[PDB]
Design a binder for this molecule. Structure first.
Ligand SMILES: [Zn+2]
Ligand SMILES: [Zn+2]
Ligand SMILES: [Zn+2]
Ligand SMILES: [Zn+2]
Ligand SMILES: [Zn+2]
Ligand SMILES: [Zn+2]
Ligand SMILES: [Zn+2]
Ligand SMILES: [Zn+2]
Lengths: 78, 71, 76, 68, 72, 73
């Protein structure tokens, strides 16, 4: 796994947190605890009460993802 | 039968992964590690019955899910 | 004075009733656990409390983080 | 952190997410896992209540402990 | 430890402990350990701004809390 | 580069912090610990759900609650 992720180094990935937040960003680095450094990250906004992805983005730039709330990482389709 | 031991024993089987929020993931397990980080092949995301996404490969933090059971 | 993890240790092979922080409950047989109190349960029956709906699992890894309580013995 | 003062006392405890219970402190560890006896959850805060008995409390959802 | 420094800096005084957007605690920090557990005297519970409980002496797992700030 | 190190270079700069809840925090990094609990000062807190803001001179932000830490934010 700490090996598997290196395969996606420098590439854009999806991430899902506990609570529901979803983001995308470029994998710049990470540790064994699953703390990430993502570049050019865009959080995918959610319908306030429906919960669904609105299609709208929000830009965050260079970010440190906390492994404590990280649930899912996944590459782009293809 | 440790959590690891249990997890090893379910490699290559369709597994059900429930989130505290009642979102489910299901896909064939593929890989593990000491910290319960799971690597799955093709993965489907459901919001109670309703498929809502598919991931070709996925990494899932076991530490942060509700449970892991074998379908 | 009783130590929590030693009590859990004595429950391997026994029935546990587990209560989460959400509206979910589990009853099964303790197969083993983590130093982090992640447990393996056999012949589990899950209880939703909101709906009241139930389902069953031959074997499962129940994560400790979301747990509130482990009750040696079973439901109810 | 000096919970030994409340050993065998009836204490009260609330969890992440709103659950609240009562019971007698029978033991604990450095990670705040507790052993409680004669436990009673106050259902949710409807006057309802259920009896759980001897209980292992997890310190990962434990938020607050208090006497009575 | 800056967290340790912040906490000590506020022992014996009144602090605001936010559990969630909905739930807060207020009281006098009295004691603390290295697992961020807190002992408070005369601690109060607020829900949506309404003081729903007074506990007196109490312990709070800082670990399972949103934040701790000096009150005012 | 290492996530922990990236936070280290931010000691003294502004930090934007996003939680798993609808709560956000912007302030200046005083310091952190091994578990990434954070001390912020001159802090402005954003409830994104209602929309109300709030202010704090100095606070300890619990690491377990954080999703994201954004340098200079
Ligand atoms: Zn770029
Ligand atoms: Zn692999
Ligand atoms: Zn493998
Ligand atoms: Zn593949
Ligand atoms: Zn189930
Ligand atoms: Zn009893
Ligand atoms: Zn280095
Ligand atoms: Zn505040």
């Amino acid at each position: 796994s700490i090996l598997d992720l290196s395969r996606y180094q420098d590439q854009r990935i999806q991430a899902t947190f506990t609570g529901g937040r979803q983001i995308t960003g470029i994998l710049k680095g990470f540790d064994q605890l699953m703390n990430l450094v993502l570049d050019d990250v865009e959080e995918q906004l959610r319908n306030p009460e429906d919960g669904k992805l609105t299609g709208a983005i929000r830009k965050l730039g260079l970010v440190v993802v906390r492994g404590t709330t990280l649930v899912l990482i996944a590459p782009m389709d293809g | 039968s440790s959590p690891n031991e249990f997890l090893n024993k379910v490699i290559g089987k369709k597994v059900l992964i429930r989130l505290s929020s009642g979102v489910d993931y299901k896909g064939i397990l593929s890989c593990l590690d000491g910290y319960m980080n799971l690597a799955l092949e093709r993965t489907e995301e459901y919001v109670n019955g309703k498929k809502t996404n598919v991931y070709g490969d996925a990494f899932i933090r076991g530490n942060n899910v509700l449970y892991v059971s074998a379908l | 004075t009783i130590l929590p993890l030693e009590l859990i240790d004595k429950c391997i092979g026994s029935n546990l009733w587990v209560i989460m922080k959400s509206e979910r409950e589990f009853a099964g047989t303790l197969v083993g656990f983590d130093d982090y109190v992640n447990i393996v349960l056999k012949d589990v029956t899950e209880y939703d409390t909101v709906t009241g709906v139930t389902e069953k699992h031959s074997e499962m890894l129940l994560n400790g983080n979301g747990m509130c309580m482990l009750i040696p013995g079973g439901k109810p």
